[PDB]
C-alpha cells in the first residue's frame, strides 16, 4: 500500500525539521506534481525528480527517497502514460544555475546502470555514503546540503 501521497511530505520532513525550506514545502511540490510530468522515468527502473524552482527555500538541498514498491508518476514528453518509479530525487533548488547542474549530475547517476543497480538493497548509511561521495566529487554542486536525515530506504 504505497502511493504518491505522503512520499513528498516524507522526504520534505527533514528539510522543514532542519529549516532548509519555508513551511509547507511538500504542498508546493505536490502542486508542481499536479501540473507537470516530473517523472522522467525513461528506463525500466523508474526515476523521478519532484521539485520546486521558486523561492520559499532558505538554501539548496537534495533529498533522496528510496521506494521498494513502485508508485507510478506521469511520464515526460508524452504525459498521458504513467510509469512506475522506485527512486525519488527531491530537489530544493534556487537561482536556476543549480537546477541544471543538479540535473546534469543526476543524468550522470541514472546512466551507467552499475550504480542504478543494487540501489534498492543498500542501507541508509551506504546510500548516504555513495551519494555524498558522488556529490563531493562532482565539479559543481558544492554548498548543497545532504545528510543522513535526507535518506529513507523505505518511504
Amino acid at each position, epitope marked *: 500500500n504505497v502511493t504518491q501521497e505522503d512520499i513528498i511530505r516524507a522526504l520534505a520532513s527533514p528539510l522543514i525539521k532542519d529549516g532548509m525550506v519555508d513551511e509547507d514545502f511538500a504542498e508546493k511540490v505536490i502542486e508542481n506534481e499536479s501540473r507537470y510530468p516530473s517523472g522522467l522515468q525513461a528506463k525500466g527502473v523508474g526515476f523521478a525528480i519532484p521539485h520546486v524552482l521558486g523561492d520559499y527555500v532558505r538554501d539548496n538541498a537534495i533529498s533522496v527517497g528510496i521506494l521498494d514498491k513502485p508508485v507510478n508518476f506521469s511520464e515526460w514528453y508524452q504525459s498521458p502514460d504513467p510509469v512506475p518509479v522506485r527512486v525519488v530525487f527531491m530537489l530544493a533548488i534556487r537561482t536556476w544555475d543549480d537546477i541544471t547542474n543538479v540535473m546534469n549530475w543526476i543524468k550522470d547517476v541514472v546512466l551507467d546502470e552499475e550504480f542504478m543497480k543494487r540501489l*534498492l*538493497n*543498500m*542501507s541508509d*548509511e551506504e546510500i548516504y*555514503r555513495q551519494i555524498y*561521495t558522488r556529490i563531493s566529487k562532482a565539479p559543481n554542486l558544492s554548498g548543497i546540503n545532504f545528510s543522513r536525515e535526507y535518506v529513507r530506504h523505505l518511504n
Partner: antibody, heavy 117, light 107 residues
Framework: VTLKESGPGILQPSQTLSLTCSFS??????????VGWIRQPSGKGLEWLAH???????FYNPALKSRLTISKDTSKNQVFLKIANVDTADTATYYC???????????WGKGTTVTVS | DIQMTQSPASLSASVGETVTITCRAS??????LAWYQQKQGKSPQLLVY???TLADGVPSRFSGSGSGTQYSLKINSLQPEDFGSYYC?????????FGGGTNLEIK
C-alpha cells in the same frame, strides 16, 4: 590493529560511569571506519549500546531511555560512554569495537568489567 | 520494529557433524547480516564479512546463506577449536540489535 580499554571497577548507583578506548594504528581521518561499544551482562548475550561514525554523528540504542551521552575526541580517540545513572541491573562487561568498512568488526578489545555495590 | 531473533538457543554435536544456525529479522536485511564467534572469557573474532563471504582468512568450513528475513550460518564439518558462542548482526537500522546467540557444545 590494537585496541585496549580503561574504566572504573566498583561504582555506587549514584555515580557516573566513564569508559574509554585506546587505539594504536587506527586512524579516524577517513569515512571508512567508525567506533562503537557493546555491552554483555554476565551469562547473557551481547547488546549494542552506541556508535560514532567518522562523520561526526551519534546514534543511541533507544532501549537505554536516553541515559547515554557520548562525546568523541580526536586526541587518543576517546569515547566516554557517559551514563547519567547506573542501576543495579547494569552489571556487565563493556567492549570497545571498530565498525570498519561495511560492517566488519575487525578490531575488538578485551573489555572492562563494570559492577555495583 | 527491527528486533532480531536466533535459534536453536542450545545445540550440541560431535566432531565432524554439519551444523546450521538460523537468524531472522522482523524487517528486511538485504544481505547485510554478519556472524562471529565468541570464546568463553574472550572477545569475539570476526568470522564472516557478510552472509556469503569469508572474513580475515578464517577456515573455509564457515559459510552461510540467506535472503530477505531468513539467514543461516552453516559449518560443513566441525573441527577442534570451533565450539563456543555464535552471534549475528545486521547493518540496517542504526541500533544494530543482536540476535539471541547460540551455544554450540561438545557432545
Amino acid at each position: 590493529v590494537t585496541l585496549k580499554e580503561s574504566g572504573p571497577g566498583i561504582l555506587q548507583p549514584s555515580q557516573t560511569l566513564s569508559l574509554t578506548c585506546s587505539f594504536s594504528g587506527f586512524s579516524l581521518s577517513t569515512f571508512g571506519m567508525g567506533v562503537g561499544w557493546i555491552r554483555q551482562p554476565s551469562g547473557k548475550g551481547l547488546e549494542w549500546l552506541a556508535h560514532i561514525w567518522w562523520d561526526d554523528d551519534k546514534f543511541y540504542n533507544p532501549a537505554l531511555k536516553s541515559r547515554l551521552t557520548i562525546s568523541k575526541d580526536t586526541s587518543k580517540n576517546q569515547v566516554f560512554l557517559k551514563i547519567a545513572n547506573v542501576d543495579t541491573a547494569d552489571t556487565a562487561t563493556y567492549y570497545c569495537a571498530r565498525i570498519g568498512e561495511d560492517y566488519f568488526l575487525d578490531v575488538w578489545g578485551k573489555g572492562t568489567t563494570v559492577t555495583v555495590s | 520494529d527491527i528486533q532480531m531473533t536466533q535459534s536453536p538457543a542450545s545445540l550440541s554435536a560431535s566432531v565432524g557433524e554439519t551444523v546450521t544456525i538460523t537468524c531472522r529479522a522482523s524487517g528486511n536485511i538485504h544481505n547485510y547480516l554478519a556472524w562471529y564467534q565468541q570464546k568463553q572469557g574472550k572477545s569475539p573474532q570476526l568470522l564472516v564479512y557478510n552472509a556469503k563471504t569469508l572474513a580475515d582468512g578464517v577456515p573455509s568450513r564457515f559459510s552461510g546463506s540467506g535472503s530477505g528475513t531468513q539467514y543461516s550460518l552453516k559449518i560443513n564439518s566441525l573441527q577442534p577449536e570451533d565450539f563456543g558462542s555464535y552471534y549475528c548482526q545486521h547493518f540496517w537500522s542504526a541500533p544494530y540489535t543482536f540476535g539471541g546467540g547460540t551455544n554450540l557444545e561438545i557432545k
